[PDB]
């Protein structure tokens, strides 16, 4: 039973944790346990797609093909029921025998001639199979669907205007004569037809065949066939889409709804307006009631209320700048600040159709606007919306609205709750005050409950928080409930894939910008001790940025005497002791002589700033005429800030993830905290500062282990430690004497740096060449030798760090590769694939099936390919034909058959095709005669239920493998990311199984911490286990403990 703080460091693919045993006085004294837990981040890695997307797309494809086949089956059953095929025109399975293959021609000729049961059946089945596109009205808004719609609408207009009478006749004549094909190809939506046109054609065909005397034009048949051609299931209902999103959380009975809503838009507007404060050079202030009243109605009156436009309305007078606005960017005040999208969308729809006098206020009630928003956000068809708003608004207005309007995107509050909030908020009263006044807002247990997927709407964040939960629960099980939990989450957690990519881009931009700056520093100071740190480049940059003038005095400063120690200091304008702010906005370059009488005062409070002393006016003029950004100049001259509030905002991180985590862990965990918040979300900047100043230099390490290092720092950041640091900084700004030399910046305890380094990396810092203390003996002896002074540096919990990789024992997944190949010539190791000429490369054509039998074609294609430098899409961009012996042109070519290698595969499409293996889900390991045999198990084998017979052999093509029988002893099954041990002749290999090559029977294992010095990027490749001495599989928990060999009894099956 120990009193300890648990420090967590959360990122998109790692959680590092540390345990610190503290005094009752909350001072950190003992480092107990640390670990790292790494997983794969919850997105498709290269593109940022979600893992669910790949599965959902396949699901919708499954449903589409299934429903089409079912509809066609019902059509055939209806044909039999209505006499049309009379009996046993069908085959052993429900398909019609001797069905004609000319349905386009028969459809076109059905208008002029009585058809036949076979031809009539073919026509109706063809109409059912190809029933064209359905509108689902105002559809012009989406990249392609626009293109398909362009083709559809073009062909519909051409059908009705140019006299061709039906889709069949127009399609036949135009497509055959002008293109040589009817059905679309490769992506083209040129010949697509709308369902309306095909329904008209079906009606006309029934009329004509009644005219010509077709025994089967029964009312039953017409009813059935029309219903089959027109019916499809309803899209998601209002209540169903509402069931998808949570209850309001304010009024459980009512749902959260409708961004495009007068009430919702007004909530957004009032939140912005109430939170909008203007900073004028000097200090901050919020809008007076008259200013808010002035701006309140302008978003409705104008199209958008631009920031500069708002400056016009208030006569704001430059030297008055908006806060929450990047003013360095040029013409920044063209930003929107507010746009009522819904109000103006409704207004533009009415304006554009003749029901609204433009720039006359929309007279519709707030209730009606809310209703329109909810209706248009909940239904995706004209009919449904038509009913909903047919209840409450006049017909012409609704028809106009159904045109031009597309709505989406809900906002997590019930219109009843927002209705109560926005009258309360209009009065004034920031959001939380009104919310508490209307409905003011705790069941503790030992173990953190699962992360609520509702509050965390993000897959990456959900997986990161879930693995943090697993880490927490394991730590608590092993050591009991923690006193406090400190949290430090990466900047990248909770950011769009676009956002993270752009952040990486600018990080590299800053890398090269700083390298250029460093080169400039080297040129200016050629003789310099080693390489320039960050503060040195900042010194030079501030020197040039300040006009070569010390900002506190205006006395010129000698360049080249910059690194003459103590000549120039980087002063914090606002004192660190009172603000805990060391931004790049709070750093000025001053002389050592002048920066000794400032004390712990702000620049405003030191140049008096209250009587406008001419020293203060000189200083303010100096800072305003420097090449400082606006933000920096604002901060330097703050005058009237909230000391404690400002240092608090600079001390912790208030992001969405961190606030949610602090409230969640505080609510539902044991956590024997003293009582004030018991959960702390450390600001990243201050944590990096503490790392640097506590001797934790940012190492040059591949290890995921560094994640634990940070976790230690955040765990030592306690209120007592913070106040001790503040006191030290205070006594340091007033020139301490309480001696001078031995006044190390307060550390959690002595030799903290060295012990933490040994504990995390198993090496004394600065010796990456040294060998690691792999074992308890090695580590404890190293700690007792290089930290003989420290009594508690060794104890019963000090074990080497072993990073824990979340396992993946999933038995499911892609059964085979996506393209299906011809399997006829599979006795020979080959398969055939139709390769277009646009994709045709020389190494494809060299294996054409008809390379021997089409020598003219072979030579023509080969020569053509030689030209244009083997560029497939370029070479065959102009139509390619075949030629007879007499030189005549005969017939085009679109694609040729190409041979491919195929030694293994999966049977697909009614055993009429072969596809490549996808990904192995398991490897069964057998021992026979001190040699190891790997049987690979793929997912299609799991589906079919066939526990494989044969184990790999290096070079034999798949057929000739070692058949496994009861003479072999089976040891274990390997899933991806299981811990394995390969004791071999060369060395001893330990690590997480990653891949098992099937052409070699070797396996790759990731080193647990992915140290780049080992293998290539931490992966041992091509380890041969056939002739290993030992080959065993181990188990490991979240924390990296309990590492034991596991012995399986029986080989497990593939299905249950």
């Amino acid at each position: 039973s120990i009193n300890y703080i648990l420090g967590l460091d959360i990122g998109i693919a790692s959680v590092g944790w540390a345990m610190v045993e503290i005094d009752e006085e909350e001072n950190p004294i003992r480092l107990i346990d640390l670990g790292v837990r790494v997983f794969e981040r919850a997105e498709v890695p290269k593109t940022g797609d979600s893992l669910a997307m790949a599965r959902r797309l396949a699901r919708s494809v499954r449903r589409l093909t299934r429903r089409r086949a079912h509809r066609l089956l019902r059509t055939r059953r209806l044909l039999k029921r209505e006499g049309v095929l009379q009996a046993a025109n069908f085959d052993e399975n429900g398909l019609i025998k001797s069905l004609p293959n000319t349905p386009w021609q028969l459809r076109a000729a059905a208008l002029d001639r009585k058809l036949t049961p076979l031809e009539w059946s073919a026509v109706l089945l063809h109409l059912i199979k190809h029933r064209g596109y359905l509108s689902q009205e105002g559809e012009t808004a989406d990249k392609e669907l626009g293109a398909l719609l362009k083709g559809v609408a073009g062909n519909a207009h051409a059908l009705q205007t140019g006299d061709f009478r039906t889709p069949a006749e127009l399609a036949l004549n135009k497509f055959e004569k002008e293109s040589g094909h009817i059905r679309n190809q490769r992506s083209d939506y040129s010949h697509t037809f709308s369902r309306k046109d095909l329904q008209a054609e079906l009606i006309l065909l029934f009329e004509k065949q009644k005219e010509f005397g077709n025994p089967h034009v029964s009312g039953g048949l017409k009813e059935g066939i029309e219903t089959l051609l027109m019916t499809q299931r309803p899209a998601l209902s209002g209540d169903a889409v509402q069931k998808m999103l949570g209850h309001c959380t304010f009024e459980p009975a009512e749902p959260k709804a409708a961004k495009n809503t007068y009430t919702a838009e007004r909530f957004i507007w009032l939140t912005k307006l109430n939170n909008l404060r203007i900073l004028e050079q000097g200090s901050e202030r919020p809008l007076t009631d008259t200013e808010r009243a002035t701006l309140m109605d302008e978003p409705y009156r104008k199209s958008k209320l631009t920031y500069a436009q708002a400056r016009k309305l208030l006569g704001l007078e430059d030297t008055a700048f908006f806060k929450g606005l990047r003013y360095g960017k040029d013409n920044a005040e063209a930003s929107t600040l507010m746009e009522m999208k819904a109000y103006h969308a409704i207004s533009r729809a009415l304006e554009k159709e003749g029901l609204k006098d433009k720039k006359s206020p929309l007279n519709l009630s707030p209730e009606l606007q809310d209703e329109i928003g909810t209706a248009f956000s909940l239904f995706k068809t004209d009919e449904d919306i038509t009913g909903r708003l047919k209840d409450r608004i006049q017909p012409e207005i609704l028809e106009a609205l159904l045109k031009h309007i597309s709505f989406d995107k809900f906002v997590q509050i019930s219109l009843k709750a927002l209705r109560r909030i926005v009258p309360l908020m209009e009065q004034g009263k920031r959001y939380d005050e009104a919310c508490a006044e209307i409905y003011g807002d705790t069941e503790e247990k030992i173990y953190l409950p699962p992360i609520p997927a509702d509050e965390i709407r993000n897959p990456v964040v959900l997986r990161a928080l879930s693995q943090a939960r697993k880490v927490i629960n394991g730590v608590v099980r092993r050591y009991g409930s923690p006193a406090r939990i400190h949290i430090e989450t990466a900047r990248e957690v909770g950011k769009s894939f676009k956002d993270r990519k752009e952040i990486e881009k600018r990080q590299e931009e800053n890398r090269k910008d700083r390298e250029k700056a460093a080169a400039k520093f080297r040129e200016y100071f050629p003789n310099f001790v080693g390489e320039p740190k960050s503060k040195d480049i900042l010194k030079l940059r501030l020197y040039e940025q300040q006009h070569g003038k010390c900002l506190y005095s205006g006395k010129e400063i000698n360049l080249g005497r910059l690194n003459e120690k103590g000549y120039v200091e980087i002063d914090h304008a606002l004192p660190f002791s009172r603000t805990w702010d060391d931004s790049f906005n709070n750093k000025v370059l001053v002389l050592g002589s002048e920066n000794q009488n400032k004390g712990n005062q702000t620049p405003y409070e030191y140049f008096n700033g209250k009587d406008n002393s001419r020293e203060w006016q000189e200083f303010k003029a100096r800072v305003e005429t420097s090449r400082f950004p606006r933000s920096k100049k604002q901060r330097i001259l703050l005058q009237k800030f909230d000391e404690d509030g400002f240092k608090e905002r600079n001390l912790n991180d208030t992001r969405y993830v961190n606030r949610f985590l602090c409230q969640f862990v505080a609510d539902r965990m044991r956590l024997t905290g003293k009582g004030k918040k018991r959960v702390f979300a450390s600001n990243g900047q201050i944590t990096n500062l503490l790392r640097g100043f506590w001797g934790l230099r940012k190492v040059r390490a591949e290890n995921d282990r560094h994640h634990a290092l940070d976790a230690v720092v955040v765990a030592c950041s306690t209120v007592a430690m913070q106040q001790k640091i503040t006191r030290f900084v205070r006594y340091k700004e007033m020139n301490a004497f309480v001696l001078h030399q031995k006044t190390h910046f307060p550390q959690p305890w002595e030799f903290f740096a060295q012990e933490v380094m040994i504990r995390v990396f198993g090496k004394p810092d600065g010796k990456p060449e040294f060998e690691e203390a792999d074992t308890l003996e090695k580590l404890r002896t190293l700690l007792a030798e290089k930290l003989s002074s420290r009594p508690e540096a060794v104890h019963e919990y000090v074990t080497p760090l072993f990073v824990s990789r979340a396992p993946n024992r999933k038995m499911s997944g892609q059964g085979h590769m996506e393209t299906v190949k011809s399997a006829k010539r599979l006795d020979e190791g080959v398969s055939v694939l139709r390769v277009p000429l646009t994709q045709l490369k020389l190494k494809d054509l060299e294996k054409m099936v008809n390379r021997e039998r089409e020598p003219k074609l072979y030579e023509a294609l080969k020569a053509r390919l030689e030209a244009h430098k083997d560029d497939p899409a370029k070479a065959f961009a102009e139509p390619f034909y075949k030629y007879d012996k007499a030189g005549n042109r005969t017939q085009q070519v679109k694609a040729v058959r190409v041979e491919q290698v195929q030694k293994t595969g999966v049977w697909v499409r009614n055993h009429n095709g072969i596809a490549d293996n996808a990904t192995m889900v398991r490897v069964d390991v057998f021992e026979k005669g001190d040699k190891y045999y790997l049987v690979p198990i793929y997912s299609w084998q799991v589906a079919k239920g066939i526990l494989p017979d044969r184990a790999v052999v290096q070079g034999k093509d798949e057929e000739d493998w070692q058949l496994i029988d009861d003479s072999f002893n089976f040891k274990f099954s390997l899933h991806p990311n299981d811990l394995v041990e390969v004791i071999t002749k060369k060395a001893r290999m330990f690590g997480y199984f990653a891949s098992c090559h099937r052409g070699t029977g070797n396996i790759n294992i990731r080193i647990h911490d992915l140290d780049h010095k080992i293998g290539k990027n931490g992966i041992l490749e091509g380890i041969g286990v056939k002739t290993a001495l030992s080959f065993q599989k181990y188990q490991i928990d979240e924390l990296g403990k309990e590492i034991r060999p596991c012995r399986l009894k029986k080989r497990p099956p593939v299905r249950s």
């Binding site: 250029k516 030079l540 070569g548």
Partner: protein, 117 residues
């Protein structure tokens, strides 16, 4: 050891058309020297920043980089028949001792002329 600021003033001669490509060349020349320390003399492509502007670049005249830069500037000036560059040179001691109101002008006045073109 001793830091020299090269004050260069870019003017338009009026004689000939501006030749936007020449503006790009001059922008590249000036921007070669700019880094985040003295990014405030970023070379734009419009006349407003290229015509009639003083820019003071800091060099270390115990390094042969100043001379190459000024030679490139002179070569461009000879090329452009319609853009004129004037170069000066001042010790950074006297430059920083000037009053920051029109320092580039005053330093040009107080500096040994280098090349007029």
């Amino acid at each position: 050891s001793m830091f020299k600021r090269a004050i260069i003033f870019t003017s338009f001669n009026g004689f000939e058309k501006v030749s936007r490509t020449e503006k790009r060349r001059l922008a590249k020349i000036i921007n070669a020297r700019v880094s985040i320390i003295d990014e405030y003399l970023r070379a734009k492509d419009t006349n407003a920043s290229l015509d009639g502007q003083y820019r003071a670049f800091l060099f270390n005249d115990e390094s042969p980089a100043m001379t190459e830069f000024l030679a490139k500037l002179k070569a461009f000036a000879e090329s452009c028949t319609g853009i004129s560059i004037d170069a000066w040179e001042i010790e950074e001691s006297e430059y920083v001792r000037l009053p920051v109101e029109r320092r580039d002008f005053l330093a040009a006045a107080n500096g040994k002329e280098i090349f007029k073109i």
